[PDB]
Amino acid sequence: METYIKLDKLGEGTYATVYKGKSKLTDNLVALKEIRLEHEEGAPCTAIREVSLLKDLKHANIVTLHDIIHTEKSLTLVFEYLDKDLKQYLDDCGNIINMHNVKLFLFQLLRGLAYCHRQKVLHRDLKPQNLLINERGELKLADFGLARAKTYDNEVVTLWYRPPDILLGSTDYSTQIDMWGVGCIFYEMATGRPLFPGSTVEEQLHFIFRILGTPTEETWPGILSNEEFKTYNYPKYRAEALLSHAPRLDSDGADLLTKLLQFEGRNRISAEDAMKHPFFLSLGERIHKLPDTTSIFALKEIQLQKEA
Ligand SMILES: CNC(=O)c1cc(Oc2ccc(NC(=O)Nc3cc(C(C)(C)C)nn3-c3ccc4ncccc4c3)c(F)c2)ccn1
């Protein structure tokens, strides 16, 4: 019964194309992820899992699956549209976002992640392209998967948000992997530029150590016993302070960033604890007791600041 038109191309993958569209029933803008049923599959397993996942997750800061459409030749997942991703948002402000708004975006990111982590969902591929933001200022987590998006177009960002302990063969694939990426997104919102833009596993680890400093048995118990680190022979860097690099962070902000960017996942501040960090004290007591399904903008003391 509810039908849709395609308006524009948002992203394109191997098996799927994502279109911007519009409901003919409601006039609401949607995203239509159309998956080609080339082989005699029914629906492909990936789509079934994506759908079963997004149906079980109900949170204001996770993208909302609105509808599914099956024809003989395609399966289309219909998501509610949001106006921009974070990178587009940055770009529309000449890479200088209102710091109050940065606080709101970070908070909402942390709210969505905390829910995911409570449902045992590791995101594992956080990056600006996966953070969608609407006119109202609501931020929702996506995973575009493949879908290469339609000047910052087509940048290879594969490793930029990857944590150094995982890049050196840690087997602790916990929700804390995301906490490192949160850190990297925070810096990028705060400065408009990526924190650790490495092309290789070796150079990603390098760039990291150029800011955080080279590890030791103090800063990383058992690090010199690691064979891969032993081989990756880096010069001993002295830690630069994060606050100099990102002056727009207050000392609370920089303190939160440092707690996110711990070499090892065991020691990073969690999403839940990060929401209680003093950095967010300006947003009040009410925001912490909101239902999962309620926008933080329901609070009225939460408002988006005009952007330049
Ligand atoms: C400017 N506006 C726009 O460009 C724009 C574009 C737009 O299009 C889409 C947005 C999101 C999705 N889908 C998802 O995000 N899926 C998802 C979320 C998660 C979470 C819950 C882990 C985050 N896991 N998986 C998810 C889960 C399982 C998967 N299995 C295989 C492959 C992928 C998978 C993804 C989509 F298909 C199209 C919507 C609004 N605005």
Residue numbers in the entry: 162 to 311, 317 to 474
Sentences from the paper on this structure:
CDK16 is a newly recognised member of the CDK protein kinase family that is activated upon binding to the membrane-associated protein cyclin Y (CCNY) or its homologue cyclin Y-like 1 (CCNYL1). The crystal structures of monomeric CDK16 represent the first structures from the PCTAIRE family of CDK kinases.
The rebastinib co-structure displays an inactive ‘DFG-out, αC-in’ configuration. In this structure, Asp304, Phe305 and Gly306 are flipped into an inverted conformation relative to an active kinase. The activation segment therefore folds antiparallel to the β1 strand and occludes the front of the ATP pocket. As anticipated, the binding of rebastinib is facilitated by an inverted conformation of the ‘DFG motif’, which creates an extra pocket for inhibitor binding below the αC helix. Rebastinib forms a total of five hydrogen bonds with the ATP-binding pocket of CDK16, as similarly observed in the equivalent ABL structure. The carboxamide-substituted pyridine ring forms two hydrogen bonds with the backbone amide and carbonyl of the ATP-hinge residue, Leu243. The urea moiety's nitrogens also form two hydrogen bonds with Glu211 from the αC ‘PCTAIRE’ motif.
